[PDB]
Enzyme design. Sequence first.
Site, PDB file in Angstrom:
ATOM      1  N   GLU B  49      -4.985   3.218   7.825  1.00 55.13           N
ATOM      2  CA  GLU B  49      -3.999   2.501   7.033  1.00 55.13           C
ATOM      3  C   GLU B  49      -4.757   1.960   5.816  1.00 55.13           C
ATOM      4  O   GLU B  49      -5.780   1.292   5.960  1.00 55.13           O
ATOM      5  CB  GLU B  49      -3.327   1.402   7.865  1.00 55.13           C
ATOM      6  CG  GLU B  49      -2.003   0.898   7.318  1.00 55.13           C
ATOM      7  CD  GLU B  49      -0.903   1.953   7.271  1.00 55.13           C
ATOM      8  OE1 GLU B  49      -0.778   2.776   8.205  1.00 55.13           O
ATOM      9  OE2 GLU B  49      -0.145   1.947   6.285  1.00 55.13           O
ATOM     10  N   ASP B  60       0.228 -10.733   3.263  1.00 57.06           N
ATOM     11  CA  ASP B  60      -1.193 -10.781   3.608  1.00 57.06           C
ATOM     12  C   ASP B  60      -1.798 -12.180   3.519  1.00 57.06           C
ATOM     13  O   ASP B  60      -1.548 -12.920   2.560  1.00 57.06           O
ATOM     14  CB  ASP B  60      -1.982  -9.815   2.709  1.00 57.06           C
ATOM     15  CG  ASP B  60      -1.805  -8.355   3.117  1.00 57.06           C
ATOM     16  OD1 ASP B  60      -2.186  -8.003   4.253  1.00 57.06           O
ATOM     17  OD2 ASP B  60      -1.295  -7.552   2.303  1.00 57.06           O
ATOM     18  N   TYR B 175       5.983   0.538  13.473  1.00 60.77           N
ATOM     19  CA  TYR B 175       5.080  -0.593  13.412  1.00 60.77           C
ATOM     20  C   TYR B 175       5.586  -1.712  14.314  1.00 60.77           C
ATOM     21  O   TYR B 175       6.661  -2.261  14.093  1.00 60.77           O
ATOM     22  CB  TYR B 175       4.915  -1.086  11.976  1.00 60.77           C
ATOM     23  CG  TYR B 175       3.647  -1.881  11.760  1.00 60.77           C
ATOM     24  CD1 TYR B 175       3.514  -3.175  12.263  1.00 60.77           C
ATOM     25  CD2 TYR B 175       2.589  -1.351  11.039  1.00 60.77           C
ATOM     26  CE1 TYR B 175       2.353  -3.909  12.061  1.00 60.77           C
ATOM     27  CE2 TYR B 175       1.433  -2.070  10.835  1.00 60.77           C
ATOM     28  CZ  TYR B 175       1.321  -3.352  11.344  1.00 60.77           C
ATOM     29  OH  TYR B 175       0.176  -4.077  11.130  1.00 60.77           O
TER      30      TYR B 175
END
Lengths: 268, 268, 395, 395
Positions: B49, B60, B175
């Site tokens: 990834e 993030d 995911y």
Amino acid sequence: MERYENLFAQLNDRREGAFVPFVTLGDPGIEQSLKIIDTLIDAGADALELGVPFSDPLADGPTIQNANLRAFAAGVTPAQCFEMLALIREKHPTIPIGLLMYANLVFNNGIDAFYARCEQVGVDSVLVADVPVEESAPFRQAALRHNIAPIFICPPNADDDLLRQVASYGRGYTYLLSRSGVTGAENRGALPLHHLIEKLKEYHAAPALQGFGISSPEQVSAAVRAGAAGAISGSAIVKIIEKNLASPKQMLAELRSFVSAMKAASRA
Amino acid sequence: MERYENLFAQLNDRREGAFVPFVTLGDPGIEQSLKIIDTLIDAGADALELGVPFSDPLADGPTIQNANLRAFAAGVTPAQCFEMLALIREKHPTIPIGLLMYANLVFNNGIDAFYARCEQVGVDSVLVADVPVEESAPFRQAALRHNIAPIFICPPNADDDLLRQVASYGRGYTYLLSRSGVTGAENRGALPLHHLIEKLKEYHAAPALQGFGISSPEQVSAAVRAGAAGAISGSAIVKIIEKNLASPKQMLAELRSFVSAMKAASRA
Amino acid sequence: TTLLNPYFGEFGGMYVPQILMPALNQLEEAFVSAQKDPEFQAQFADLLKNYAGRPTALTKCQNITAGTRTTLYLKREDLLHGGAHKTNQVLGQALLAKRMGKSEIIAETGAGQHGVASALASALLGLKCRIYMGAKDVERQSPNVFRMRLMGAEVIPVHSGSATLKDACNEALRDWSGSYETAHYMLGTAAGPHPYPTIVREFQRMIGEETKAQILDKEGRLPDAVIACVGGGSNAIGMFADFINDTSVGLIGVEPGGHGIETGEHGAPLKHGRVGIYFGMKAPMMQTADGQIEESYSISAGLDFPSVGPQHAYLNSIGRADYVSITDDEALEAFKTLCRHEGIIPALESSHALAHALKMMREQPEKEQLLVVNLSGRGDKDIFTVHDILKARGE
Amino acid sequence: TTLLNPYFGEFGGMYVPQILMPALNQLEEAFVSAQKDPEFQAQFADLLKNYAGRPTALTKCQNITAGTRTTLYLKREDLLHGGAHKTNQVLGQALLAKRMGKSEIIAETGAGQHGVASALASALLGLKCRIYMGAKDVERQSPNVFRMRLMGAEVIPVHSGSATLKDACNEALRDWSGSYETAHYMLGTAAGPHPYPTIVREFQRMIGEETKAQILDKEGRLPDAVIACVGGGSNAIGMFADFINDTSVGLIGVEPGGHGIETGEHGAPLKHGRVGIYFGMKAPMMQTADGQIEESYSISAGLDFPSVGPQHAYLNSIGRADYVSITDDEALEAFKTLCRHEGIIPALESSHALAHALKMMREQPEKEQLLVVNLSGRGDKDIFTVHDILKARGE
Ligand SMILES: O=P(O)(O)OCCNS(=O)(=O)c1ccc(OC(F)(F)F)cc1
Ligand SMILES: O=P(O)(O)OCCNS(=O)(=O)c1ccc(OC(F)(F)F)cc1
Ligand SMILES: C=C(/N=C/c1c(COP(=O)(O)O)cnc(C)c1O)C(=O)O
Ligand SMILES: C=C(/N=C/c1c(COP(=O)(O)O)cnc(C)c1O)C(=O)O
Ligand SMILES: c1ccc2[nH]cnc2c1
Ligand SMILES: c1ccc2[nH]cnc2c1
Ligand SMILES: c1ccc2[nH]cnc2c1
Ligand SMILES: c1ccc2[nH]cnc2c1
Ligand SMILES: [Cs+]
Ligand SMILES: [Cs+]
Ligand SMILES: [Cs+]
Ligand SMILES: [Cs+]
């Protein structure tokens, strides 16, 4: 009030105006102040205007503000002022002595008691700066009961009612204000308005002394020429004290020269 | 998307889960990043990834924020990222490569053109972090037209409608988000919720990879034991980069040891 | 699926990580429910009137229009409790947070006025408030930092990026994506993901409603134009909303021109950016050729943001509203002019709006026009900033 | 002779140098004329409503009275344009100055709120404004110094005496005695020589009038008591006036207790001074045994004055109003409490009033009482002062 009557009678006989210095009592210290006042008298002062140090003197500019501050720095109180006044009167039996007071110092622990103390030490007049004629009744009544002259102010724009009140209520001398504002040598007042002078005479007022911003012999002469009975100078005198704090001897010599010149100008 | 199908078929045959490291492309520089990625692969990464540096990466935490910053400090652009991707694919023909994108980089000068560039360089999947399934139509359509797998997220509190949409819309892998919040090694996510895993399988979703806060071999094992097809680790990998910026050689050795251990855990 | 349209033409949407979509849908649902709840509306109305001081005055300028054919009124949001329009919709969102059973509040702030509003509402209504503020803004808007902390809010300096409003937005959103179960994100402007642009408009629209009633009372007619600064879009859309269907009423939004559009140091994406996706929405933004989000610049912290709310992008696209820009120096001149000739100290944000109205007047002094400027805030927070500038320039 | 009574019982009068009596009589005459001029009243009313933002809110405290039988309302003068009640009567006096053909304004200020009000009114109405402010206050109320100067007023630091409010008063009065032909002295409180205590009451009495109408609307009855701080007397007499003939309504004035009455460092002449003559009036003052005026002390610049207006001396003497004191520390606690539990940052002056109401509640928590506190100002000017204190005390 009789000491003023005798003074003005004597001055009239000699075709003379009065010169009257102002100083703050106890500035810069009690002993030096007493010597200062002796020098003013010996130099020819016809009468004295003497300030009792007050915390908030609102009719006074910076010069006399600072005189009050110096006196306080020396720990001067109204009681000590009256001690000084006794001493001055003991040495000088005939000179008229006027006090420049602010209302709270007179009102503080009894108006009557204040004027009684004035009479006891031999003060001749009291000018309460922040009491207009409109508020004056208990002050002038107490003054007259104790044979003290209450001094009232005739401002440049005084109307007829005020002139008549000042003439009736006041004794000793009439204060003829040179200008608006607060005390100050730098701010020169105008000539004595002749209409006020003649109107006061018409109403049998006490003789007029011009004050505020009078700091030169020329101004003293002009005041007497205009018909006033004399002139008062404060800040110009106090500036000499302030200038010579470090030189007590030079202070007195300069005071003597200045006062002599101012007095000479009153003979014109 | 075929490279993922082959991978998961191979892993299933070997009774193995996948281990998939994340790194930012061009962190800390282009050449070192290329070496880093070679080391990840040689150490046993089943897939990659890879982040394209973005100015405002809102999914993030600080670790990967700072990875983006280092890449930018090295002047890394999306064009240079695609140059790197060509090089990586040239060396490694079968490993699946997924990109971690933010929407604006994909949308910028044409969604279709972006996925076309992905297909040209041999990328296998694209995860757009700030596009929910609700906004995904033009992205997943463009992806499928260019034989790219669009990756969608199954959050811990996914309802049935979402599970069915993710199963239908996504390709390559699903995911499986370990927890709420942003990326971060310090914030450990929970075990794969078994109900989600089994529901995704029921709906024939692409195989699930667990991600966020996976930073130890124990967690990788637990993910595979719980039924997930594998696990992704990013911040734990990036922290090794950050820690060894001054020692390129030590960086790679530590990356190799860590990745080896993480991969071994996926065989459990 | 949503209850309400998340788009204004091409612009808007819900471009958030999947994890946050339930929170957004929950908020939308609570909003729709509250809007038809007479008890909610009475609580909200009572707070606006008896706590915040609505309705705010509409002030006719007596001096700054002398010798022209311009009549200028100022809608006095500077008189609102807290010192800016921000307080209006914060009271509504705080009530929504309670309605949804949340006990914590997250907020971004730039000028510190939304932060102060968030803090005061949290103090009043019993919520735990934490505020993100760019470190640059902590300095240039420092009085509001003191006010927030005195009211018990946690103020968290943000040092990343430009250390201004966009960076505070980023951190607030990162926080919410992990804390949404207990925390409500009290977004401070008409931007971000649906339903915020809609909620913020509806909770600010009393500005235009009052303005309309007040101008009708004083002038017997609608304004020729209403003028408002645009940082994210809330005070402008609050002023605009009730006039949108009054086709004769011009709607003018003022973006920050910073040091000059030509310098690239500005905050004017509507007219000088291009459509992008960031902070949960599809909207005009300042961005690089590659699609990185640019850092904005304005002398005013409240306008210093590289994007803009989607309803303004839409109103512009169809020509219903016009958007212009005003530079730092133009805003400063308007600031000084209002202080010295009307005795009102305006927020530097609001001064951009005033500056444009003064330009409309000065450029065409014999043009008959009736104008309203939204005076969105008072300038207490700016006096130290402005003073230092005027001193370093003689004055 | 005067048109109106210059006294309240023994207290008041016109103890100014003879030179100023015409100015005072002129002002009294202009006031009497203006009060019966419908055009003046309409101008004044229009400014109060559309410029200053009257009526101000009456806010019910939701939290700080919890668990007691006290209902507490705050009359929100903190929401007035300028940030304090001072603005009310300044608008009226400014109009009087114009009516008398004066083009200049002199004002004293301590907290800087009267200075700000004087400056903003002068900017609006075309007057040249100069403000005296004690040098100590220039520092501890510095935000208002910036606001005044930005509005074009000349601010003159006063270093003499205690360098606080009384010293500014002194200089303003000295100035006026020389400049009264062209300058109006815009005295900022209900004290000084007649006609000021009367004029200032009449130009502040909307506070109590509004409060009465608002409390009747919300509670169906009059308050048990109204509570206000007393620096010179204007916000308190403005609150009191309309209730004086409502014999059941307690009137409570709060003097500053400073570091404690026993320390001599306070500003509480009404209860701890004695009658004297100073600043144009006969009133209670802090004075030495000899009759020198003492220097006062309060943490709050606005209360730091060694005397008090004559109507309060009178109301106290006949028992119609009761006066109490609140210390620095008590005011600070009330400040913090209001910030954290109602989301309002009060002036430290106003915090003295709040502190006493909190004491009334806490001392007798099961006593049923309906109270109004006059929240005379907002606390923006105080936040740096309070912050520094709280830091030097841990917190
Ligand atoms: O020469 P200057 O300018 O210093 O003036 C000296 C005056 N000293 S004084 O005692 O006569 C004097 C007389 C009157 C005063 O105030 C009042 F007019 F309001 F009553 C103040 C001082
Ligand atoms: O190990 P961690 O905690 O650093 O997490 C690594 C994740 N890196 S990633 O590319 O898979 C990844 C996947 C999804 C992300 O956001 C989204 F869920 F909103 F889509 C962000 C990063
Ligand atoms: C960013 C902030 N302020 C914005 C602001 C603005 C611009 O924001 P809107 O476009 O959302 O009105 C306008 N006027 C004032 C007084 C403001 O404080 C803030 O207070 O956090
Ligand atoms: C002395 C000043 N202020 C007094 C003040 C006072 C006390 O003054 P009054 O007693 O006249 O209301 C009360 N509340 C506030 C907010 C104040 O600013 C001044 O602003 O110059
Ligand atoms: C009204 C309600 C929901 C909607 N979703 C998309 N457009 C809409 C309009
Ligand atoms: C732009 C962006 C975010 C904001 N929050 C409050 N005002 C804003 C303006
Ligand atoms: C009314 C009017 C004038 C006055 N002067 C003294 N007392 C009065 C009452
Ligand atoms: C006491 C004295 C003078 C004042 N000016 C304004 N407020 C005051 C309080
Ligand atoms: Cs005009
Ligand atoms: Cs902007
Ligand atoms: Cs209660
Ligand atoms: Cs006092």
